Amino acid sequence: WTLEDFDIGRPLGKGKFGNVYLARERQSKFILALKVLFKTQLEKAGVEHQLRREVEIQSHLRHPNILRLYGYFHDATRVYLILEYAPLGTVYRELQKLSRFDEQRTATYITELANALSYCHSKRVIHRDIKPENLLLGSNGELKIADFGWSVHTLDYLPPEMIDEKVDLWSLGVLCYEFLVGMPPFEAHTYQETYRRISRVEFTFPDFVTEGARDLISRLLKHNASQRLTLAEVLEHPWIKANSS
């Protein structure tokens, strides 16, 4: 694989480590995405080895709710990822467009994360970076989890033990709240305020969040990590079963 193999389209997203572009294989016509990472930024942040970890992890993961990495290669000062293209964009963009999600879309996305994270954990992978800007939408509106850079084998999304696998469960409950409310639950003006609220698990619901949702989120956002609700318990949760497509 080399740059020569691809036609590049429009920018899909700007990241701090690199840019995403829509692309087409020249000798397959197949549509895909291409993420350019500059070594400059990788070595100055000391994440070079992490990228090699992501690459090996994404060599083992096949699930309809996980974005595929078909392959990778490097130039002289750039590393390239060849990714499944997600036509309908990020969940983050959609949340900005809609301002908040209804119960049905929220429960459906939460079901799709949980199936996906359940598959990861069964393969001994913890994602650790669950957040709206790393959730993508396929052709049929399907949630796809992307970006396995911080995977192992803002501060708003970190569980208190970060300020094993139960971190994904805290992140999941942060997501569910953010999906319904349009703001993550420990949002504050100062960094110190935000830290204090996370450690204390100090959040409140606006009146429009229903009892079923409050229960789900409360069983997820617990200081004691091992007492958080499991992925199987999330999929079997009454509010999820009632609202999920």
Ligand X SMILES: O=C(O)Cn1ncc2ncnc(NCCc3cnc(NC(=O)Nc4cccc(Cl)c4)s3)c21
Chain contacts with ligand X (rule: CB under 6 A): 12-13, 17, 20, 33, 35, 47, 50-51, 54, 67, 81, 83, 85-86, 89-90, 136, 146-147, 149
The catalytic residue among 75, 129, 156, 215 is: 129
CB of 25 to ligand X, least distance (A): 15
Question: Does 133 count as an annotated binding residue?
Answer: yes
129 counts as catalytic: yes
Question: Does 187 count as an annotated binding residue?
Answer: no
b/e 129-160 (16+ beta carbons within 10 angstroms → b): bbbbbbbbbbeeeebbbbbbbebeeeebbbbb
Neighbouring-strand partners of residue 82: 34, 71
Contact criterion met (CB below 8 Å) for 33 and 12: yes
Torsion of CA 92, 96, 97, 100, to 10 degrees: 100
Nearest residue (CB) to ligand X, 128 versus 166: 128
Place of tokens 């084998």: 153
How open is the CA angle 166-209-140, to the nearest 5 degrees?
70
Nearest residue (CB) to ligand X, 20 versus 110: 20
Question: Does 29 count as an annotated binding residue?
Answer: no
CB of 99 to ligand X, least distance (A): 19
CB of 233 to ligand X, least distance (A): 28
Nearest residue (CB) to ligand X, 52 versus 200: 52
Structure tokens at 23: 């692309």
Question: Does 83 count as an annotated binding residue?
Answer: yes
CB of 226 to ligand X, least distance (A): 29
- Give the 3-state secondary structure of residue 152: strand
Name the residues annotated as catalytic.
Answer: 129
Known binding-site positions: 16, 35, 83-86, 133-134, 147
